[PDB]
Amino acid sequence: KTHVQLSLPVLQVRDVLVRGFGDSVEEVLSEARQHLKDGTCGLVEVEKGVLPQLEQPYVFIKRSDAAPHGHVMVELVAELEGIQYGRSGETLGVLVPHVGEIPVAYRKVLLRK
Ligand SMILES: Cc1cc2ccccc2cc1O
Numbered sequence: 001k002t003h004v005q006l007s008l009p010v011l012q013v014r015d016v017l018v019r020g021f022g023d024s025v026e027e028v029l030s031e032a033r034q035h036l037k038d039g040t041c042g043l044v045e046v047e048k049g050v051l052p053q054l055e056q057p058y059v060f061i062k063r064s065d066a067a068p069h070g071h072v073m074v075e076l077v078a079e080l081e082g083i084q085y086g087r088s089g090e091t092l093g094v095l096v097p098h099v100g101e102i103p104v105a106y107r108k109v110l111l112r113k
Pocket of ligand 1: 032037111
């Protein structure tokens with residue numbers, strides 16, 4: 001299937017133990033997809049002061065369309081030193097590894113793989 005319904009744990013940036021997916025745009029998009037597939041991916045909602053507390057390159061989920069079954073359709077866009085790889089809609093948040101941190105909510109998405 002081109003898309004997958006996921007419920008992502010929403011984490012507070014100060015709880016996150018592993019603050020990115022790796023060291024290159026291609027690596028972080030790769031790792032993000034593997035963590036999504038394995039159910040070990042979290043979401044941090046972007047506010048003032050969040051991104052400087054996480055590691056570049058960043059992996060964003062962005063709204064890909066204007067919401068089947070409660071799930072917003074999203075796709076992955078990476079960012080390194082102010083350059084984005086992909087073009088999409090509004091940021092829903094930044095993806096990070098999940099290693100058992102307690103979430104504040106769950107965000108239902110329909111993810112383009
Ligand atoms: C991102 C992503 C998620 C998946 C979930 C279930 C099965 C396959 C998947 C492949 C993917 O690239």
